[PDB]
């Protein structure tokens, strides 16, 4: 069989798969999933019959009931999702090699006629607000306007919610919070806003940044209220003290706050829409909007008419040549970001009038897995972990900005470096567990072996590692000035995961104001037109904080759900 229609009509009607019409149920295609798991049995179920010691197709930790046309289309060869990522040895039936290639906004200018005739058409649905982006800013904006008596559509481009915050692992800043108190930590919205701006350098807009520190204890509570456990409080570098809020026992922030913001939007019955991708903010005779055009990947292109639109649609940091054309120093680097954040909907605001600011900053994250090409969270060095050289030595400050931690690694023999750990720091922080789990961090009794296994001068590493412990015990680290230094690494096994630069989070975008409200170049008000998270510019100026961006994705998601509902 050339197909998995083909293969599975060999013993069965069409109406196995599909309606009594024949017609596909809607861009998430509910009515034909629905048909394979009844056949096949739930993802869960499906994966007893597919375990791999290390991996699983049908297990992930991805979040919300991810579909299997996610990766098996029926009438044509697909892709494994996972291999946007990872390389694990998969053998799908009618697979076909990974390979992106979503046109851009402009090149949907071709489309003329479709687009026509369905602007012509009535809308297909008529809401209050259309919310674009299933990320932590979008579903959090979906959720507050409607808890604000607006009625809503959640619309995602890809067949899988949460953008790049459902890999979030380091944690959520937030400062003087109840959680903080518990861990006997001292704050407040002043000392995080102060690291902020000096964080950023002093670029960015300190009305936005205000917001983000005077909210950030009330987005946490707001969290917390819908389900979520925020109590670890750990650090990541440029905060004065811990502030960094995820999970009991340090495990990932991501995928467990897009988890319970799904929760939430599906226990008050929001409109999510898959496989459907914003492509056009439509306006009135007046500027402000009237509505959206939107192209759903299996029904075609439709609009929706509404009051207000909702951008959350996340950054640029996966798309190179645009990362290259701003940056010429981060081309052909690796990037940490889901397949689609590629920028699309900056070019739907600027289409709609947005403008741009501070879109020369991009972020990259130092320590990406060599071996697997993933982020390796900077919560491994706020736990305790060091970084060393293949000399074996300590070269740099760990807890240190993104640039220079990525600039200092850069520098060492390789252009890469090794995070160093022992078994209090792995205990301290369950996500290491993940990366062990990956095959990325290699261990052994004694650093002298470690080093033979990982081309790390042996004798060198140990006294390395000696020296740091002895500065931990002083408390000062009078070697690389480190402020936090945590925990000594002297128990148990020892471990090395090597580590390189990549491209990570665009800190330009959309420029708002304090409600969220998009402008344009002379600063006037869209109205209509709302931005949140990511897709923003101003908050996070020439440097983001560690920490900082699931804090914003749910800050402003929030306000400007709340702002779009009242606005109407
Ligand atoms: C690997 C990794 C680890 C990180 N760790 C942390 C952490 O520990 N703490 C922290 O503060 N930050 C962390 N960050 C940053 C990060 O989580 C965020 O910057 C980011 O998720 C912002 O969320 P968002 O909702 O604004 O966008 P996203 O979560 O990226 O969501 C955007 C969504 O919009 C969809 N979309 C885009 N364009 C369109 C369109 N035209 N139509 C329909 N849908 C569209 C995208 O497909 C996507 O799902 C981490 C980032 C990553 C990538
Ligand atoms: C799009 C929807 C579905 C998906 C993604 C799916 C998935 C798959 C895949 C990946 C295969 C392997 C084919 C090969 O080996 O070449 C398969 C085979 C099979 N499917 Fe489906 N399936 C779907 C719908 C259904 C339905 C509706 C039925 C029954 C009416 C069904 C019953 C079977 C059977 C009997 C086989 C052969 C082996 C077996 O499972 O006993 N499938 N399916
Ligand atoms: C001869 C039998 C069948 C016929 C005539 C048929 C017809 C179609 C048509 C016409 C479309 C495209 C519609 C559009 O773009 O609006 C489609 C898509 C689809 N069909 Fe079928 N179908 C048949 C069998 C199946 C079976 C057996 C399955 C599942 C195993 C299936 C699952 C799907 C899915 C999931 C889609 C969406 C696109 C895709 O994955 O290719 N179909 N079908
Ligand atoms: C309930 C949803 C799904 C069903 C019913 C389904 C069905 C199946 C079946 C029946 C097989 C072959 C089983 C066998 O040969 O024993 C298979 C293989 C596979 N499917 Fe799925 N699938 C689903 C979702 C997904 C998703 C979401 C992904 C990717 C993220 C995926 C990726 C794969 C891969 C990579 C393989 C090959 C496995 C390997 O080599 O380990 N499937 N699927
Ligand atoms: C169904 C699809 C996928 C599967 C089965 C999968 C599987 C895994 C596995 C087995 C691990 C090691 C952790 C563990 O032991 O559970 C892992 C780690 C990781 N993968 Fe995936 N992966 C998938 C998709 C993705 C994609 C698309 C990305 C990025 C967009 C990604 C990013 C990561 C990250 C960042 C980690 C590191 C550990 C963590 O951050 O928790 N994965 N994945
Ligand atoms: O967990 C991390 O390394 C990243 C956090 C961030 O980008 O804020
Ligand atoms: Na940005």
Redesign the pocket.
Known sequence: ?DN??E??VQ??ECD??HTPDGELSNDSLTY??T??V???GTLAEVAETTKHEHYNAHASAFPGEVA??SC?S?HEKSMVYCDSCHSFDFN???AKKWLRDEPTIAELAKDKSERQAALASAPHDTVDVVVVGSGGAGFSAAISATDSGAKVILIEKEPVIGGNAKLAAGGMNAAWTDQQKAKKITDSPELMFEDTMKGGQNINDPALVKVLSSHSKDSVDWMTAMGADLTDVGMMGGASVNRAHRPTGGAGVGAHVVQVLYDNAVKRNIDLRMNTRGIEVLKDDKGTVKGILVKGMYKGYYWVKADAVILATGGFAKNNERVAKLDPSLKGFISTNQPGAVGDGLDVAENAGGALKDMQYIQAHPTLSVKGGVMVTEAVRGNGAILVNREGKRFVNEITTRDKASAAILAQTGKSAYLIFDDSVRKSLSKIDKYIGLGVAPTADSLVKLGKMEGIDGKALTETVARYNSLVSSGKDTDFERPNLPRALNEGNYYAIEVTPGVHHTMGGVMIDTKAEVMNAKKQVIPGLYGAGEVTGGVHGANRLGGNAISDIITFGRLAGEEAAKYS
Do not use: D, I, K
Request: glycine share 0%; proline share 4%.
């Open positions: 069989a998995l229609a293969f599975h013993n069965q196995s798969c034909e999933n048909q394979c009844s056949c096949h299997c046309t098996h029926a799908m039936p009618y």
